[PDB]
Amino acid sequence: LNVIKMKSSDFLESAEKVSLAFHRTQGLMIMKTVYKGPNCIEHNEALLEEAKMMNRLRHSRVVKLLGVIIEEGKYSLVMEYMEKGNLMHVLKAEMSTPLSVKGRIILEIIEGMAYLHGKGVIHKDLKPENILVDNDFHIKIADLGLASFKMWSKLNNEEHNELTLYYMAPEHLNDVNAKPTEKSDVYSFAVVLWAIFANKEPYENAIAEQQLIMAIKSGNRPDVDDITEYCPREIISLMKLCWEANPEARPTFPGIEEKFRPFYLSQLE
Numbered sequence: 200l201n202v203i204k205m206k207s208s209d210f211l212e213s214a215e216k217v218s219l220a221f222h223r224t225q226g227l228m229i230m231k232t233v234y235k236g237p238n239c240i241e242h243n244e245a246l247l248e249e250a251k252m253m254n255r256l257r258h259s260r261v262v263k264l265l266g267v268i269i270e271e272g273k274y275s276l277v278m279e280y281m282e283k284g285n286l287m288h289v290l291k292a293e294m295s296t297p298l299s300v301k302g303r304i305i306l307e308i309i310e311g312m313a314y315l316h317g318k319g320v321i322h323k324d325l326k327p328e329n330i331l332v333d334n335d336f337h338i339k340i341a342d343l344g345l346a347s348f349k350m351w352s353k354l355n356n357e358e359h360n361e362l363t364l365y366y367m368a369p370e371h372l373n374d375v376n377a378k379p380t381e382k383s384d385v386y387s388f389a390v391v392l393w394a395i396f397a398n399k400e401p402y403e404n405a406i407a408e409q410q411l412i413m414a415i416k417s418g419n420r421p422d423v424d425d426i427t428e429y430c431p432r433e434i435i436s437l438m439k440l441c442w443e444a445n446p447e448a449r450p451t452f453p454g455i456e457e458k459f460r461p462f463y464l465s466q467l468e
């Protein structure tokens with residue numbers, strides 16, 4: 200389905216920024232309020248078309264943009280509701296996630312990124328907080344930071360509006376000139392891989408941001424010995440392949456899928 204021009208009145212009053220919302224006739228949804236301030240109707244057509252463009256990225260592992268709210272002095276994006284929150288919340292839950300499910304999660308992240316890259320989309324902000332999980336532990340990739348919503352991100356920072364580095368490729372640390380590439384996303388995926396088996400964030404011993412940044416650029420990586428549960432040797436090799444310093448030596452997501460899928464099916468599923 201295409202993007203719906205929804206209205207603020209469509210949602211139940213819950214006055215008392217991604218939050219849960221209840222559409223009067225459609226049910227639970229996620230709302231990201233982006234702008235609240237003076238009237239800026241000059242940008243409406245530009246904001247709507249960008250939402251239409253983003254809404255065209257349709258894939259089983261990509262979150263759906265259900266609608267937009269474009270009113271006088273109020274602009275919001277309305278997104279599919281993923282009941283279980285983000286991947287890091289799932290990994291830290293009291294109930295353990297079995298290896299078969301972790302393998303499926305990895306495969307689905309690969310499928311989603313292969314789709315996005317095939318559409319010429321570079322995510323640039325891939326991390327557990329942008330990987331959302333539904334009731335059945337299937338995942339969908341999101342862009343909650345608006346890294347790909349150029350127009351909406353600019354709106355979010357217009358001053359008249361009232362309203363992590365662990366997964367960033369080293370070529371981007373301490374460097375604003377560096378333009379992210381598909382290979383930047385592959386590096387982020389490598390660290391997500393580590394997090395999936397560590398059940399936590401990397402670099403817990405880092406003491407200072409400058410220490411952490413200079414260390415990673417010098418070759419430091421998440422502590423593979425820190426994984427406490429069983430992590431298949433193939434997956435350790437995979438993450439090492441994906442966080443290699445030379446970006447052009449990192450594989451593609453289709454290349455990752457070609458070797459991970461048959462391994463998932465014979466060992467993990």
Ligand SMILES: O=C(c1nc2n(n1)[C@H](c1ccccc1)C[C@@H]2F)C1CC1
Nearest residue numbers: 231253254256264340341342343347
């Ligand atoms: O997080 C959001 C969101 N909305 C959409 N996605 N994420 C998908 C997507 C994923 C990765 C890269 C680009 C788009 C396509 C869809 F339009 C909304 C709340 C801001």
Ligand SMILES: [Br-]
Nearest residue numbers: 443444445448
């Ligand atoms: Br090299």
Ligand SMILES: [Br-]
Nearest residue numbers: 433458459462
């Ligand atoms: Br593999």
Ligand SMILES: [Cl-]
Nearest residue numbers: 456457458460
């Ligand atoms: Cl394949």
Ligand code: NA
Nearest residue numbers: 259260337338
């Ligand atoms: Na599915």
Ligand code: NA
Nearest residue numbers: 363364365366
């Ligand atoms: Na990061």
Ligand code: NA
Nearest residue numbers: 405407408411
């Ligand atoms: Na730090």
Ligand code: NA
Nearest residue numbers: 442443444445
């Ligand atoms: Na390296």
Ligand code: NA
Nearest residue numbers: 456457460461
């Ligand atoms: Na295959």
Ligand code: NA
Nearest residue numbers: 460461463464
């Ligand atoms: Na398969």
